[PDB]
Scaffold this active site. Structure first.
Site, PDB file in Angstrom:
ATOM      1  N   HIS A  41      -2.242  11.730   2.692  1.00 32.47           N
ATOM      2  CA  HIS A  41      -2.242  12.170   4.084  1.00 32.47           C
ATOM      3  C   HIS A  41      -0.850  12.521   4.592  1.00 32.47           C
ATOM      4  CE1 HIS A  41      -0.429   8.563   5.764  1.00 32.47           C
ATOM      5  NE2 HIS A  41      -1.359   7.784   5.242  1.00 32.47           N
ATOM      6  N   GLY A 143       5.166   4.027   9.965  1.00 31.89           N
ATOM      7  CA  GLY A 143       6.071   4.441   8.915  1.00 31.89           C
ATOM      8  C   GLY A 143       6.011   3.612   7.651  1.00 31.89           C
ATOM      9  N   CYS A 145       3.416   3.374   5.557  1.00 30.39           N
ATOM     10  CA  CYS A 145       2.532   3.927   4.539  1.00 30.39           C
ATOM     11  C   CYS A 145       3.313   4.245   3.270  1.00 30.39           C
ATOM     12  CB  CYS A 145       1.835   5.184   5.062  1.00 30.39           C
ATOM     13  SG  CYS A 145       0.749   4.886   6.474  1.00 30.39           S
TER      14      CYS A 145
HETATM   15  O1  5ZT Z   1      -0.451  -0.136   8.968  1.00 35.34           O
HETATM   16  C1  5ZT Z   1       0.026   0.681   9.758  1.00 35.34           C
HETATM   17  C2  5ZT Z   1       0.409   2.040   9.423  1.00 35.34           C
HETATM   18  C3  5ZT Z   1       0.927   2.849  10.377  1.00 35.34           C
HETATM   19  C4  5ZT Z   1       1.364   4.282  10.168  1.00 35.34           C
HETATM   20  O2  5ZT Z   1       2.544   4.471   9.823  1.00 35.34           O
HETATM   21  N1  5ZT Z   1       0.474   5.274  10.356  1.00 35.34           N
HETATM   22  C5  5ZT Z   1      -0.919   5.134  10.808  1.00 35.34           C
HETATM   23  C6  5ZT Z   1      -1.853   5.867   9.854  1.00 35.34           C
HETATM   24  N2  5ZT Z   1      -1.454   7.284   9.753  1.00 35.34           N
HETATM   25  C7  5ZT Z   1      -2.421   8.193   9.266  1.00 35.34           C
HETATM   26  C8  5ZT Z   1      -2.245   9.586   9.331  1.00 35.34           C
HETATM   27  C9  5ZT Z   1      -3.221  10.455   8.846  1.00 35.34           C
HETATM   28  C10 5ZT Z   1      -4.411  10.000   8.276  1.00 35.34           C
HETATM   29  C11 5ZT Z   1      -5.462  10.949   7.752  1.00 35.34           C
HETATM   30  O3  5ZT Z   1      -4.983  12.288   7.853  1.00 35.34           O
HETATM   31  C12 5ZT Z   1      -4.567   8.606   8.222  1.00 35.34           C
HETATM   32 CL1  5ZT Z   1      -6.045   7.920   7.516  1.00 35.34          CL
HETATM   33  C13 5ZT Z   1      -3.618   7.713   8.696  1.00 35.34           C
HETATM   34  C14 5ZT Z   1      -0.079   7.416   9.264  1.00 35.34           C
HETATM   35  C15 5ZT Z   1       0.888   6.673  10.184  1.00 35.34           C
HETATM   36  N3  5ZT Z   1       1.090   2.398  11.665  1.00 35.34           N
HETATM   37  C16 5ZT Z   1       0.757   1.127  12.084  1.00 35.34           C
HETATM   38  O4  5ZT Z   1       0.915   0.748  13.239  1.00 35.34           O
HETATM   39  N4  5ZT Z   1       0.235   0.323  11.091  1.00 35.34           N
END
Ligand code: 5ZT
Ligand code: 5ZT
EC number: 3.4.19.12
Lengths: 306, 306
Positions: A41, A143, A145
């Protein structure tokens, strides 16, 4: 003596963490040999998060769209491919700090260490367990991930988890290093919920053995139950049922303490039905279930790593 | 989201751990530049542990009596000296993996990460706090002496603890890196006991702020107490008194949540007098006091290290 939430030394993993940028999205990557692994992603924008078509999004990208940084050194991406939910970035330089590694998929109830990273820089290390509902109770901010979970066997780093997202209940979900999600989750921002969690019974028993080794004995008794009489009480309190394999795994702990597994089950049955009455076990007022029998042996006998 | 007992990445410290052998005694050493630091009781035998005269014991030793191993590479000892309770072994090779470091002495209530080692090999990493009675509640087995505690500021490793011994109550005691013991302990196997421990109040308040940030709000109320009315209740329950400096340290946490420090003190006063009534806070049924206000900010805002 003593008992702590102990994580593995993260040195061998710190040298494999890189920063991956695609567009305005930046997350962490795992640099092993000449391949960088990161969540797929990273190629998504705001318009794609809710209904992404990763086939289309990846075909519209080229190698120069991916910026990979190992500290200040830039890694030239010479190829890209997608394996399930993980993006594999081929780079021109093989990581000279690549340790002996393997990719393993863990089961619910097993523990591992998490190296939480941001912008390719390690921030902290902690221990967690894969819950029976295939989530983990981690500590992650925006951030994080691409952060990885791992165990260390002898001199080999067994990678078992890559962080992808946080669920609405505050728990976390990810994949193995082959890109296959733990649990029925997908990497799109839809309304997903985890199933009901249960307590890992074999881990609680291992934690009770650690208490006896460290001098906590107030909960013991001379009763003995059967495996079926215990499982009838356990399922009432949302505990995982206990199997004969679980009994055999607890063998070394029962031999070191001289307390049979079915004896300890009778003590756990009493703790479930009467509570702990303001008393503590190893500094906790709750029954801990995130220590495996191996974690207890390793901490109460002292095995190092090469 | 989430909150874990998070330790610092141990990579920069793993490369400084060596094995030190003198006679039949083997423990861990810290290899920085061309100096190896280790507990001075490595020169003791069975006849000396109860009444050692380290001046006499060291004068009867030569450089070839000390065997230092960095993995398989042997380090030639070209000199030795004693600084308080720490032995300083000058070696012919400067550690090429020596990070930017400094020696700091921490205060009671501060936290640090421990890299538990055996035979010079890192075994695990965990977080602990210096207790008000100058002990730590660690996890150490036989052979762990010489293991070090540390914090990481930016890119600098601040060494603050070296493990020396376990007390009869199961807690642990050690020195700073200059050889000066934390607390009124000495490195001889006499019957020493730690004083009465107290709860670190400022750390409990910081941990309550972490709960509010993560969604736990059931313990809050609209009351407000004064610093003196709170300290009257705190001293009844063996809590450290709260000062104006403690209030200022909690500033950033109060601003992020919009809950004044004296407001949170009123909630803590109620939790001390009525208990928690079977409810939990951040997955704990007890009040946690091993997270500093800085640990909470670092984990609930995400600061990495270089
Ligand atoms: O555990 C965490 C992670 C986190 C974090 O960096 N994110 C949230 C998830 N995000 C995301 C983007 C696109 C898709 C699909 O296109 C999906 Cl599924 C997820 C990336 C950025 N933020 C938090 O607060 N907690
Ligand atoms: O925390 C620990 C450490 C530990 C351990 O390796 N020890 C115990 C202390 N011991 C020692 C020897 C001589 C003197 C004075 O000559 C002193 Cl003061 C201490 C070294 C060997 N064993 C555990 O079980 N727990």
């Amino acid at each position: 003596s003593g008992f702590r939430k102990m994580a593995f030394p993260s040195g061998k993993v710190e040298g494999c963490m890189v920063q991956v940028t695609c567009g305005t999205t930046t997350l962490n990557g795992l640099w092993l040999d000449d391949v960088v692994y990161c969540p797929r992603h990273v190629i998504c924008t705001s318009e794609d998060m809710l209904n992404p078509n990763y086939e289309d999004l990846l075909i519209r990208k080229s190698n120069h769209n991916f910026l990979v940084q190992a500290g200040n050194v830039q890694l030239r991406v010479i190829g890209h491919s997608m394996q399930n939910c993980v993006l594999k970035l081929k780079v021109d330089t093989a990581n000279p700090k690549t340790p002996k590694y393997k990719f393993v998929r863990i089961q619910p109830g097993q523990t591992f260490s998490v190296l939480a990273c941001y912008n390719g820089s390690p921030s902290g290390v902690y221990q967690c367990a894969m819950r029976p509902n295939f989530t983990i109770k981690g500590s992650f901010l925006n951030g994080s991930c691409g952060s990885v979970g791992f165990n260390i066997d002898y001199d080999c780093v067994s990678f078992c988890y890559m962080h992808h997202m946080e669920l609405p209940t505050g728990v976390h979900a990810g994949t193995d290093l082959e890109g296959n999600f733990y649990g029925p989750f997908v990497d799109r921002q839809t309304a997903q919920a985890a199933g009901t969690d249960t307590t890992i019974t074999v881990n609680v028993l291992a934690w009770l053995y650690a208490a006896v080794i460290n001098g906590d004995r107030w909960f013991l008794n001379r009763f003995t139950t059967t495996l079926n009489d215990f499982n009838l009480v356990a399922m009432k309190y949302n505990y995982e049922p206990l199997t004969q394999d679980h009994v055999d795994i607890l063998g070394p702990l029962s031999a070191q303490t001289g307390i049979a597994v079915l004896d300890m089950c009778a003590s756990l049955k009493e703790l479930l039905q009467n509570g702990m009455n303001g008393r503590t076990i190893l500094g906790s007022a709750l029954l801990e279930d995130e220590f495996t029998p191996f974690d207890v042996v390793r901490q109460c006998s002292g095995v190092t790593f090469q």
